[PDB]
Amino acid sequence: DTMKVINDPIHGHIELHPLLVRIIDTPQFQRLRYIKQLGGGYYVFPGASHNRFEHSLGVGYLAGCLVHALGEKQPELQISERDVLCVQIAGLCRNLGHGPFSHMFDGRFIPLARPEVKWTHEQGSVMMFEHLINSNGIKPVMEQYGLIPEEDICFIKEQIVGPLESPVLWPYKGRPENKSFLYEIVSNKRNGIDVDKWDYFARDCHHLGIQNNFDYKRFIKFARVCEVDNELRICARDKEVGNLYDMFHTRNSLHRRAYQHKVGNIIDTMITDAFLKADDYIEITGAGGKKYRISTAIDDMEAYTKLTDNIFLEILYSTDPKLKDAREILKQIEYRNLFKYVGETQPTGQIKIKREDYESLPKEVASAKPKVLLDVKLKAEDFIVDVINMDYGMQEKNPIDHVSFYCKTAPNRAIRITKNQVSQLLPEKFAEQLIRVYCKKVDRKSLYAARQYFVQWCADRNFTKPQDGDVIAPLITPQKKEWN
Amino acid sequence: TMKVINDPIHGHIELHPLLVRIIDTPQFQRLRYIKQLGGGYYVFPGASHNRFEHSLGVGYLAGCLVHALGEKQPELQISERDVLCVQIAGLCRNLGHGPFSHMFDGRFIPLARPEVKWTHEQGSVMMFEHLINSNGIKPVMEQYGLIPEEDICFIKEQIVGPLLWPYKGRPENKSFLYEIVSNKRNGIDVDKWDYFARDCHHLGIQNNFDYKRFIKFARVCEVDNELRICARDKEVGNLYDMFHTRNSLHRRAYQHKVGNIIDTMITDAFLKADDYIEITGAGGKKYRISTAIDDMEAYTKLTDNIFLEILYSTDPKLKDAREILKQIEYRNLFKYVGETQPTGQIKIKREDYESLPKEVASAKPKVLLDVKLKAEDFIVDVINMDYGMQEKNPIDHVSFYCKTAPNRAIRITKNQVSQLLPEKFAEQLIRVYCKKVDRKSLYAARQYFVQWCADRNFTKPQDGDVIAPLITPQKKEWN
Amino acid sequence: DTMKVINDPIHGHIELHPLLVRIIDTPQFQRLRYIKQLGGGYYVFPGASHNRFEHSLGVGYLAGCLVHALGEKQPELQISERDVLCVQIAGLCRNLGHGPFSHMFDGRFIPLARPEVKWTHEQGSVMMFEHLINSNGIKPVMEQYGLIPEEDICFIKEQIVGPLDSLWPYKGRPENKSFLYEIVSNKRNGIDVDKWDYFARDCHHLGIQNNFDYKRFIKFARVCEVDNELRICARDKEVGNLYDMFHTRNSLHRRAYQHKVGNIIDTMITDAFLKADDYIEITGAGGKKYRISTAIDDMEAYTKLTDNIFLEILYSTDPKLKDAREILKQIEYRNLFKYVGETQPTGQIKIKREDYESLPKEVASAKPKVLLDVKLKAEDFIVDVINMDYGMQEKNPIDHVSFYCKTAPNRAIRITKNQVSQLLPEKFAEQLIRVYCKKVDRKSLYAARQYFVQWCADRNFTKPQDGDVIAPLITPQKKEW
Amino acid sequence: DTMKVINDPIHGHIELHPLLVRIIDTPQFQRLRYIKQLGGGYYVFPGASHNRFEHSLGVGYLAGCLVHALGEKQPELQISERDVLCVQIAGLCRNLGHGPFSHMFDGRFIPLARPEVKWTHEQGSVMMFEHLINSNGIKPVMEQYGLIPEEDICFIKEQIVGPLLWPYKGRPENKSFLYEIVSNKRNGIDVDKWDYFARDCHHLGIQNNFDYKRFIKFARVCEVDNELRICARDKEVGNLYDMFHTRNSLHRRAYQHKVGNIIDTMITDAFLKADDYIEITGAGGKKYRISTAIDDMEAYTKLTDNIFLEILYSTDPKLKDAREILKQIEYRNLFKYVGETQPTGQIKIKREDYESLPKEVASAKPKVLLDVKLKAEDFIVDVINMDYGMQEKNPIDHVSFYCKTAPNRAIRITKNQVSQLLPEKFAEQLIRVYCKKVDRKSLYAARQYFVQWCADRNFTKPQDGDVIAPLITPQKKEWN
Ligand SMILES: Nc1ncnc2c1ncn2[C@H]1C[C@H](O)[C@@H](COP(=O)(O)OP(=O)(O)OP(=O)(O)O)O1
Ligand SMILES: Nc1ncnc2c1ncn2[C@H]1C[C@H](O)[C@@H](COP(=O)(O)OP(=O)(O)OP(=O)(O)O)O1
Ligand SMILES: Nc1ncnc2c1ncn2[C@H]1C[C@H](O)[C@@H](COP(=O)(O)OP(=O)(O)OP(=O)(O)O)O1
Ligand SMILES: Nc1ncnc2c1ncn2[C@H]1C[C@H](O)[C@@H](COP(=O)(O)OP(=O)(O)OP(=O)(O)O)O1
Ligand SMILES: [Mg+2]
Ligand SMILES: [Mg+2]
Ligand SMILES: [Mg+2]
């Protein structure tokens, strides 16, 4: 019928076009109300109760703001109402594929449960989106508002997941090269500067109790479309380059303080463990009454629709003896009897730990031979080793090298700015790894032992000296001259 | 040692290790799965907050106030023991909340167990006792200098009131300690201060009451042979504003017409599921949603999860309950028709609520209608709005002191403050909704409703002339 | 010339059309950087350092937001870019007439210095605006952007001061654009963008939280026909929010704008200005010299009249300015006139402006019947009378608001108080009376308290809140108390 | 005298001890109400109307919060009420020496007006403090609250300016940590920064990412090389790096905004041209100039942002030139920014050379056709030192930490134990060039000289170099 207004604490009163309202009011979308944005983060930051639902609204809203701003300043781009709606829909829908506790599901659980599969929430989102459209008769409604479902559905999916085919050249079918800038708004594959980040910076900061340093409204006011290598791309004003570096700094701060908090991560790990032990016994009904498992619900969207943070409580409140082991792990979370953090270290020089080796790392720590008297001996299964990749979104690459700028005196001429033209106080590297070790045996003597193994292992591998190394393992740290 | 927790409202809060022990139990952690505002989240998408974080905030603020009083007035002899008991009461006053908070004890239990008299306060005391006993907390209390017999009694009394000086947990010289967590005299307590700031932060509305200011100006003075908390005289304006803010929040958010109808629909689903959902309590015995309040072990497991258990069920027995919840997901909600109030001296009684849909359906609007509606097509929601004390002004039950005589308590009347304040402190709103959502039904529903208002002499609905132009002229009182 | 972006802490990044930039970059406008929004309030709330300049930008911005919103939702209104600019200009320029310390100047100083004259900041704003336009060659620039100076200047002035009888009293725009006159300074009911900026700005600086959401209001606003005018109508649902908006305004007055100490500091500054008024010279047009009290007669002199006068007096060495300087120095040492107490007239009693001068005499004429060391005279008392209302004297402004319903968006309606709530005020205006004493020693203050409470008893005013404590021998004689 | 409560938008309701109230209610302190925190920043960020007065209150408050926190957690430090009050007084009083438009005065005006003198706001503050105490009979009042004026006044001054082997006389080595609260000379981590981060962010419309309340909760005193120092929890090292990053951001975006700086420069110019004619009465009726008022505190007391308006509203023909410059600010006819570059070479341009830089730019010989020829006096060259507060040094190397398992044992954490994503350098210089000739042809020319000069000196390629000077940038192969 007409627009709805929604009050969001981050963006204020947001207007939603009636087509967007139709998409929102479906089981597939409403599911996001039962998925925590930050997963296990809520168990450390009690303000982080927010869910993927409200984040999706914000992304949809901001995507609209940017495409409206570009059209208003540059009418010659011929941005249509159709374009605007398609960008908003992609914005709303890019989080549809998230599973229970968000990054826990595709970052920890699926890789362990279905190692062979290559699953990302992005692929999930496209499949969920297709299911949403077809199950709810949205195509007719799209037609009613001037959309062309064949080309526009393709455009929406491409915004979320990138080109759906091998092109080998313009690889996209939803829109031509003169509308290339539209693909940079929701999920920016070139440099990661998109409206998804801008919403979560402000939303997560508001809920976590941390203040956000990046100003997205400012960026929107200064954004322009310019020709770059025969594409029309979004360009930023030159003098905003400092702010872009700060945006990635902020992202990295948020990961350090919150998203990769050592305890938040161990809770995610414990929940994943419970899910693995429950995976043979939980049944989720999908299409035609068929039953799926937590690990196979990703193969049927009807089942996946019903896969939310509810699984946690279904296990916790179960009485089935088959779920006893899964239930016991979750109960340990309630009593705060967590696996204990031992410490953190990093590889030095060039060392980079591969995913294929993650499984062997607890074995290595347990194989260390600290020269200290120990009452207890620990085994591989008593250790957890978490490897964390921290970067500016593009592996070792500087994403600001993939941004186009313009100057005040020549607004149509795109230019490049190098790091050395900005500041000497910027990072010289853009990627790193952290290694955390935890112990499943929580008593005083086990933990003392775990610390000696860990510090010995760091010494043997030539990793960095843990910050508290001299205090937790005063007999071990002297043997390493590099640390003294 | 102490844990530090980062709360978005209060910042970094320090928690004494005994509080940490109480928090890290199934009975307390349960509050992570209970939305503060129930169905409000379905209208204000920022309101994702749960009872858990609110409880921390209350416990913190209760500590702030008692610490402040002890610091300024050492002669009160506030002990570390007192402080901890007030913080524990603060942490634990929300323990008795059920699924979707006020939906559960405000709508569901009254309909499901009309004979019973249940409040979340009573729930909290029972849950607290169960928490203590199930988790071996008494020894730990002893270890930090608490005396469980007296102090458990003190804590419960802070939450629910007395189970002469009617209290056993502390004597009259510590009377002021009973005003911090749940203030039975006038409702000015740290529970409100936390939810004002927390709800505002999540709802996207700005809070006008400054509790830090209040804490700086609070003193204990003798009032009728009790030591009570007294506010500085100048602060009386801020107190009126505190209640105004509360009433605003209810108007805009807690009693939002759609939030309420969603709570109503969820309640309906729970009623239809109540025969079939089984909750295991003590000794393996099975309970229903409506009887889980009789066993704390079962109640521990009763959270917002029930909603999703019903929604995702495949059992044909749960078909009807599941259908209602699915209507919520598609946003096929019962439609709001309008709102009115009783005029003059009319007050609608709880005993009459059930007859009201019948009355609306019996109205005979003189207009041509395609469809005829029945009682079962109408929902009538009666909402009591007040300043927390029925028709009473709660500021009449506050004690103040002046700068020139800080130990002398005084009273301030409404007329000494402002003529721009309310003359009444309680009122009723009547909302009507229609279960039939099509265009013709809605048209008809509007004519019935306005006719009914006219017949009953209720206030003219705001949009009355637009929704029912043939009906409103017949009433001269309305023009 | 292109658009400038400006970062405001309240509104974020605001875009300004180049014509607005031209108006801003003049002595007449830049003057507002040197005038405190809240006058003496800064001496009580140290966060309130903000000036009229930034407030004006905000008003100009919000006026643009609203007129843009209306044009986007209802293209049939035929709002032109010309209309938008004229509304923004009126928004920017409605504060131009403010004098030193804002409301101190026209609320206290001018009435005392020039009792014969009838001056308001609104009239000041129109005169300043005219002077700004003419002194800076703005008329040609206006023509360059499609404005028609004859009509549009008239329109801008009318937005600020109202019509310069009749169904339609305005000349700048016709009745089909009536809704444009409701944006910047709403004479019908006071619901305008000026309030929305200062609620959010003052709250941000004072450390108080604002409960009115103007962005919400903009989203729900529509233009409808009302009595053959096109007016702005609010959605029916929003009527509660409008009552709250006036409650918030009254809260802010109670807590901040009429703070008892902020007011006494304004009074002291006014006193210093009065004592300096013979000696301070301000050069206006053609080199003529003016006084602080006559600078309002020449805009060139008025342009140079800012909070700077305060410091010019404070730092003076001239013996002629000794008395003015001593008062201000008492402010620095915080040796202020002492607050005695506050009371109200009962029920429906109102004091009027003509009587204000006789009030110190009355207090001094009270005969307490308590033993006193010192006797006080009329000149030792200050009596401040404060009118608190919902912006329209005894009237309910919500009675002058038009609403619309969801089911009939083009049909305007009225909503009465009884259709909203029984918990609303039954009265919309009241007076406070504050008494202060210029003699600050312990014995004088004790005496002042007895006179004051006796006077309250004699006049049948309300019992001061601390009456029993400050005057325990006086309050028993009144059984009603 | 009892405690006063004051409502600050940043900190909320702050309680002030009556002795602090007595210090605040003096001409010497109240003067800070008339001095903008950010100077010419207000002319770019209209929210930045805040003055030094409210910042001083915030610093005094936070200094009290921290010393109270330390005493409460570690009674064995023997912090007295006397210690607390002295730290709060230093906190309140460290801004007393600021002149008109804050950093404009001692960063630009005094160096140009009195090149021979060595003046800082810190020295100003100690002299103002002494004058405040003596003019207002504060010593007796101090005694009344348990202070010992001889030792405590010395302590307060030392906290502000440093020492006038253990070099301090106000307190012994076991109270070393008290000298780290208000102006931390060891590493710059102090409560002054925390207040201005939050205050400036609130007014500028930028959000602050350092949490000082968190830091206070985790701070401890530990023994380090026979001194008792403040130590941070090991975990918090990341937050400290972020604190300095925030400081640098704020300088980049706001404190050193290219236009805010040019406005300060123009105001400085006007002050220079007014300095012979403005008279400020000091002690015994002696007259001082703006540039000599720093020699007499009675005169300096009266030296505030008011000078700006006294000049602007003057009618004296002698002040005509000063008045014209300020009027150009009102009409926004500013000196025009030409561009920004940095040295590539490791030697910092020295303060002694600043004067010769306009001459160098004017001596560049761009190979381009130019209508107009520019002279040295048409160029302004502003050299800006950006660092982490300690020249080339990493201030986190001068921070002590402690671990959860051994809270009294201080440790060091090196940059490599924290992250590879941190800066490799901690100091740099920016060079901004502006032109006093604002017409289109002069500005075109200025751009060619500037880029040519960058090329000749081997400075970095200006960001817009290829657009402003397309004929000049190709000649430098390094720039591609
Ligand atoms: N008074 C208020 N102040 C702030 N937010 C509000 C207020 N009232 C409602 N909201 C929020 C809740 C929603 O997120 C959003 C829309 O609510 P509302 O405008 O009441 O829509 P609605 O759909 O209930 O009304 P209708 O369909 O009658 O327009 O604004
Ligand atoms: N850098 C940060 N900024 C703001 N809040 C943070 C930061 N790091 C953690 N928090 C939040 C999460 C928690 O709510 C609270 C306590 O976290 P933290 O200090 O990490 O406790 P911890 O228990 O993990 O550390 P430990 O047990 O080692 O002392 O602060
Ligand atoms: N990095 C920033 N972050 C937030 N606000 C900023 C930043 N830089 C400047 N501001 C503020 C200050 C001003 O109020 C407003 C305009 O500043 P800026 O965009 O620098 O314009 P400018 O006129 O100085 O540059 P130009 O004229 O080159 O476009 O934004
Ligand atoms: N109602 C309020 N809410 C928030 N801040 C306020 C309020 N009233 C005053 N303030 C601010 C202004 C000052 O910064 C600070 C103290 O003001 P106030 O309490 O009025 O003290 P006062 O000195 O005027 O009263 P007194 O001496 O009578 O105790 O609080
Ligand atoms: Mg609706
Ligand atoms: Mg911990
Ligand atoms: Mg006072």
**CATH code for the domain of C115:** 1.10.3210.10
A280 and A138 housed in the same domain: yes
CA distances from A412 to A224, A225, D453 (A): 8, 8, 27
Phi, psi of C340 (to 5 degrees): -100, -50
Residue whose token pair is 């509304």: C87
* Residues of chain D by 3-state class (helix, strand, coil), percent to 5: 55, 15, 35
Q: Considering only CB atoms, which chain D residues are within 8 Å of C206?
A: 7, 9
D202 and D59 housed in the same domain: yes
Q: How far apart are CA A354 and CA B448, in angstroms?
A: 72
Spatial neighbors of B356 by CB under 8 A, at least 6 apart, are: B348, B380, B382, B430
Pocket lined around ligand 1, Cβ cut-off 6 Å: A 5-7; B 43-44, 205, 252, 258; C 213, 216, 237, 241, 406
Ligand 4 within 6 A of C112 CB?
no
* Closest protein CA for atom 5 of ligand 2: B6
Q: How far apart are CA B174 and CA B179, in angstroms?
A: 10
Known catalytic residue at A207:
no
b/e sequence C308-326, b meaning 16+ C-beta within 10 Å: bbbbbbbbbeeeebeebbe
Q: Do C211 and B459 touch (CB under 8 A)?
A: no
Measure CB to CB from residue B424 to each of C208, C236, C423 and give the nearest one.
C423
Size of interface A-B (CB pairs under 8 A): 89
- E strand spans, C319-407: 338-343, 381-389, 403-405
Query: For residue B125, how far is the Cα from the chain centroid?
Result: 17
> Which candidate in D121, D131, D203, D257 is catalytic?
D121
- Give, for C314, the enclosing helix (H) or strand (E): helix C308-314
Spatial neighbors of D368 by CB under 8 A, at least 6 apart, are: D448, D469, D471, D472
Residue whose token pair is 């599911």: A31
Please tell me the total count of domains within chain A. Answer: 2
Closest residue in C to D41 (Cα) is: C7
Ligand 3 centroid to Cα of residue A223, in Å, is: 14
How far away is chain A from the Cα of C13, in angstroms, using its nearest Cα?
6
How far away is chain C from the Cα of B206, in angstroms, using its nearest Cα?
5
B93 and B216 housed in the same domain: yes
Query: For residue B126, how far is the Cα from the chain centroid?
Result: 18
A130 and A8 housed in the same domain: yes
SS3 for B408?
strand
Residue B278 and residue B291 in contact, taking contact as beta carbons nearer than 8 Å: no
Spatial neighbors of C41 by CB under 8 A, at least 6 apart, are: C48, C206, C256, C257, C259, C262
Nearest Cα to Cα of residue A14 among A70, A73, A55, A75? A55
Q: How far apart are CA D424 and CA D429, in angstroms?
A: 15
- Give, for A103, the enclosing helix (H) or strand (E): helix A103-104
A281 and A357 housed in the same domain: no
Spatial neighbors of D405 by CB under 8 A, at least 6 apart, are: A468, A471, A472
Could you say which DSSP state residue B127 is in?
Answer: H
Cα C249–Cα C253–Cα C256 angle in degrees, nearest 5: 125
SS3 for C420?
coil
Ligand 3 within 6 A of D334 CB?
no
The structure tokens listed for B157 are 């009394």
Final residue before a domain boundary, out of B312, B332, B352: B332
Could you say which DSSP state residue B166 is in?
Answer: -
* Total Cβ atoms within 10 A of residue D342: 21
A324 and A219 housed in the same domain: yes
How far away is chain D from the Cα of C198, in angstroms, using its nearest Cα?
13
In this structure, the strands spanning C403-405 and C229-235 are: parallel
Nearest Cα to Cα of residue A346 among A429, A269, A273, A264? A429
Phi, psi of C480 (to 5 degrees): -60, -30
State the distance between the two ends of chain D, measured CA to CA, in whole angstroms.
71
Cα B434–Cα B438–Cα B443 angle in degrees, nearest 5: 70
C99 and C131 housed in the same domain: yes
Residue C285 and residue C300 in contact, taking contact as beta carbons nearer than 8 Å: yes
b/e sequence A375-414, b meaning 16+ C-beta within 10 Å: eeebeeebbbbbbbebbbbbeeebbbeebbbbbeeebeeb
Mutation for testing the D interface, residue in C20, C25, C49, C310 having most D CBs under 10 Å: C49
Nearest Cα to Cα of residue C402 among C389, C386, C392, C415? C415
The structure tokens listed for B388 are 């927390």
The structure tokens listed for B181 are 């967590």
Spatial neighbors of A195 by CB under 8 A, at least 6 apart, are: A59, A62, A63, A65, A66, A91, A185, A186, A216
Q: How many CA atoms lie within 13 A of C422 on its CB side?
A: 20
Q: Which residues pair with residue D430 across a beta bridge?
A: D384
Residue D197 and residue D246 in contact, taking contact as beta carbons nearer than 8 Å: yes
B308–chain A Cβ distance below 8 A for any pair:
yes
* Residues of chain B by 3-state class (helix, strand, coil), percent to 5: 55, 15, 35
Residue type (1 letter), A409: T
Q: Is B260 exposed, middle or buried (0-12, 13-18, 19+ CB in 10 A)?
A: buried
Residue A214 and residue A246 in contact, taking contact as beta carbons nearer than 8 Å: yes
Residue B239 and residue B231 in contact, taking contact as beta carbons nearer than 8 Å: yes
In this structure, the strands spanning A284-285 and A224-228 are: unpaired
CA distances from A28 to A34, A220, B300, B382 (A): 11, 31, 30, 34
SS3 for A27?
helix
SS3 for C8?
strand
Query: For residue B296, how far is the Cα from the chain centroid?
Result: 21
Size of interface A-C (CB pairs under 8 A): 23
Q: For chain C, list the contacting chains (3+ Cβ pairs, <8 Å).
A: A, B, D
Q: How far apart are CA D412 and CA C114, in angstroms?
A: 71
Q: How far apart are CA A472 and CA A456, in angstroms?
A: 11
CA distances from A166 to A155, A162, A183, C416, D22 (A): 16, 11, 17, 67, 77
DSSP track, C133-187: HHHTTHHHHHHHTT--HHHHHHHHHHHHH-----S---SSS-GGGGGGGGSSS-T
How far away is chain B from the Cα of A309, in angstroms, using its nearest Cα?
10
Q: Which residues pair with residue B381 across a beta bridge?
A: B431
In this structure, the strands spanning C4-8 and B426-434 are: unpaired
Active site amino acids of C? 121
Between the CA atoms of B270, B274, B277 and B280, what dihedral angle is there, to the nearest 10 degrees?
Answer: 110
Residue whose token pair is 């008492």: C330
Nearest Cα to Cα of residue C398 among C178, C191, C115? C191
State the distance between the two ends of chain C, measured CA to CA, in whole angstroms.
69
Ligand 5 centroid to Cα of residue C235, in Å, is: 12
A421 and A317 housed in the same domain: no
What is the widest separation between alpha-carbon atoms in chain B?
77
Q: How far apart are CA C239 and CA B165, in angstroms?
A: 47
Residue D293 and residue D282 in contact, taking contact as beta carbons nearer than 8 Å: yes
B301–chain A Cβ distance below 8 A for any pair:
yes
Residue B155 and residue B88 in contact, taking contact as beta carbons nearer than 8 Å: yes
Q: For chain A, list the contacting chains (3+ Cβ pairs, <8 Å).
A: B, C, D
Mutation probe of ligand 3 site: the residue of C3, C4, C7, C8 with most atoms within 8 A of C-beta? C7
Spatial neighbors of D54 by CB under 8 A, at least 6 apart, are: C46, C47, C49, D8, D199
Q: Is D140 exposed, middle or buried (0-12, 13-18, 19+ CB in 10 A)?
A: exposed
Residue D240 and residue D210 in contact, taking contact as beta carbons nearer than 8 Å: no
DSSP track, A180-210: GGGGGSSS-TTT--SHHHHHHHHHHHHHHT-
Spatial neighbors of B437 by CB under 8 A, at least 6 apart, are: B332, B333, B334, B335
* Closest protein CA for atom 7 of ligand 2: A257
Q: Considering only CB atoms, which chain C residues are within 8 Å of D327?
A: 27
Mutation for testing the D interface, residue in B12, B217, B403 having most D CBs under 10 Å: B12
Q: How far apart are CA D316 and CA D278, in angstroms?
A: 10
Residue whose token pair is 């390629």: D461
Nearest Cα to Cα of residue B49 among B189, B203, B190? B203
Domain that holds residue C94: 1-335
D363–chain C Cβ distance below 8 A for any pair:
no
The alpha helices in A279-417, defined as continuous H runs, are 301-304, 310-316, 324-334, 361-367
SS3 for A20?
helix
Dihedral sign, CA of A237, A239, A240, A244?
A: positive
- Give, for B7, the enclosing helix (H) or strand (E): strand B3-7
CA distances from D111 to D36, D98, D120, D121, D298 (A): 20, 15, 10, 12, 22
Cα B418–Cα B423–Cα B424 angle in degrees, nearest 5: 140
Nearest Cα to Cα of residue A465 among D238, D411, D224, D221? D411
Q: How far apart are CA B25 and CA B95, in angstroms?
A: 12
C210–chain B Cβ distance below 8 A for any pair:
yes
Between the CA atoms of D465, D467, D473 and D479, what dihedral angle is there, to the nearest 10 degrees?
Answer: 60
B207 and B236 housed in the same domain: yes
Final residue before a domain boundary, out of A337, A362, A387: A337
Could you say which DSSP state residue C342 is in?
Answer: E
Nearest Cα to Cα of residue C312 among C337, C330, C292? C292
CA distances from A159 to A61, A118, A156, B450 (A): 16, 19, 5, 51
SS3 for A235?
strand
Could you say which DSSP state residue B381 is in?
Answer: E
DSSP track, D389-429: SBTBS-GGGG-EEEETTEEEEEE---GGGT-SSSBS--EEE
A279 and A371 housed in the same domain: no
Cα radius of gyration (chain C):
24
Q: What experimental approach yielded this model?
A: X-ray
B410 sits in the region (left: phi over 0; alpha: psi -120 to 50; else beta) called: beta
Residue type (1 letter), C378: A
SS3 for A325?
helix
DSSP track, D343-393: -SSSSPPPGGGGGGHHHHHHH---SS--S----GGGEEEEEEEEESSBTBS
Residue type (1 letter), A362: P
SS3 for A446?
helix
Measure CB to CB from residue B301 to each of A8, A47, A317 and give the nearest one.
A317
Could you say which DSSP state residue A358 is in?
Answer: G
The structure tokens listed for D71 are 């005493």
How far away is chain B from the Cα of C321, in angstroms, using its nearest Cα?
37
Nearest Cα to Cα of residue B207 among B197, B198, B193, B192? B197
C77 and C64 housed in the same domain: yes
Q: Considering only CB atoms, which chain C residues are within 8 Å of D313?
A: 304, 308
Query: For residue B120, how far is the Cα from the chain centroid?
Result: 9
Ligand 4 within 6 A of B212 CB?
no
Q: How far apart are CA D419 and CA D424, in angstroms?
A: 11
Residue B205 and residue B253 in contact, taking contact as beta carbons nearer than 8 Å: yes
Phi, psi of D444 (to 5 degrees): -55, -45
Ligand 4 within 6 A of B238 CB?
yes
A208 and A344 housed in the same domain: no
Q: For chain B, list the contacting chains (3+ Cβ pairs, <8 Å).
A: A, C, D
Final residue before a domain boundary, out of D278, D304, D333: D333
- For the CA of B258, the closest atom of ligand 1 is 24
Spatial neighbors of A402 by CB under 8 A, at least 6 apart, are: A190, A191, A394
Mutation probe of ligand 2 site: the residue of A43, A45, A249 with most atoms within 8 A of C-beta? A45
